Design a protein around this ligand. Sequence first.
Ligand SMILES: N[C@@H](CCC(=O)N[C@@H](CSCc1ccccc1I)C(=O)NCC(=O)O)C(=O)O
Ligand SMILES: N[C@@H](CCC(=O)N[C@@H](CSCc1ccccc1I)C(=O)NCC(=O)O)C(=O)O
Lengths: 216, 216
Amino acid sequence: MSPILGYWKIKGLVQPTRLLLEYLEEKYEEHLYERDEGDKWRNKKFELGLEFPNLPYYIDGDVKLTQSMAIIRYIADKHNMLGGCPKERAEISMLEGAVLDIRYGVSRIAYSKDFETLKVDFLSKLPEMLKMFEDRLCHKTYLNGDHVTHPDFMLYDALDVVLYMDPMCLDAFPKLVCFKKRIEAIPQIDKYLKSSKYIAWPLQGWQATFGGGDHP
Amino acid sequence: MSPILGYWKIKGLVQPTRLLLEYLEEKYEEHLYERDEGDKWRNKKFELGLEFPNLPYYIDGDVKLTQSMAIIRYIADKHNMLGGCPKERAEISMLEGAVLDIRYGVSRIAYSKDFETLKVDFLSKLPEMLKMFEDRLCHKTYLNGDHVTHPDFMLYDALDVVLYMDPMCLDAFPKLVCFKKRIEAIPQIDKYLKSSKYIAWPLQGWQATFGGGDHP
Ligand SMILES: N[C@@H](CCC(=O)N[C@@H](CSCc1ccccc1I)C(=O)NCC(=O)O)C(=O)O
Ligand SMILES: N[C@@H](CCC(=O)N[C@@H](CSCc1ccccc1I)C(=O)NCC(=O)O)C(=O)O
């Protein structure tokens, strides 16, 4: 029985997890809830055996999990990708948080009716955040070295998003522009992005002022 | 040389980490920035050797970290507390996220000038969130069983906070009311709470509409 990954039919908080699964060439099925299926989900919420019911969820022969970060880390952990010692594991967790500051930075304002005003102060702070990654990649191929790790897919997802907000936010960051291409040059990812499973939009929930709607 | 833990002189995102250090009886020094030291911190931000400068930070003979979650997990990891296998480690990470939904739920609205209106919709959703923990503790002493883990201190910190917002939010949750007492009955914690190091207020940054100010 193939693992089930439930979530809205958007990119949201699970996009990075989808990408890690594709990368590892893991098999899995998806329980996607359409914009109007809110009710279809509420009637199942407390019937799946989840100790902490929420979206996304991940169910397979071994576990039943919720909290998108617990899920991506589990899939990575099952492939010995979380780090070989305390120090390395803390390096990888530091990369997770730094990426989330960016990604969550967008979500916290993408639902306000004053998006444009908020979008201005945000983009004034985004640069400092990007440059930390720009330097981290000065001599590395990927965030943790020569081998891909899950924070790589999270960062990719964050760049894909801040680029919709502002197509020029990476002009001063060549290594990040390259990092983004390099992730797409990975065989498994390129296949996925061109397959029928890829969900290109929306970025956030359909009702958001930014990254919302049924079409780009 | 004792590990240094830097942060504002508030509870904020580091309170749970302080508590884990006390519990493990680890020695450490703190670099606390007063309300008016914002400038004292900006002039040091890019001079500590941190790959991703931010508050809090943790510096000792082995690592230099940022991102509060990477730090608490490191201190726990160095004591073999993160879980003995993939499944257990995902259980503990699931507990982290579920706690943060509550804790971050407060911060996301504690800075708005319309706190009271927001505080109403929040408290209407808090119950469902608390009950997941209320059930998780139905037969367990602590969140992961008979032994304390870091999510325990995070949850404690979240209850201490939602209780200031509403002293009655735990009336229908006896196991949670007990969990909170039990954490305080732990020798090391009780000592800390009564020592000169404990910082009782503010909950958030001083400028917040809720949990702010120099006094309760
Ligand atoms: N921390 C949880 C948050 C889960 C969450 O916010 N779930 C939303 C969808 S993502 C909404 C979201 C939240 C924050 C940032 C971006 C986005 I998109 C939901 O509809 N849950 C189902 C329910 O509550 O019944 C996790 O990561 O799993
Ligand atoms: N994800 C980072 C966020 C760090 C952060 O927000 N730091 C704030 C203080 S906590 C503010 C905060 C943020 C979110 C929720 C609650 C709270 I209190 C800061 O002043 N950083 C120093 C700087 O930017 O130079 C982490 O957890 O370390």
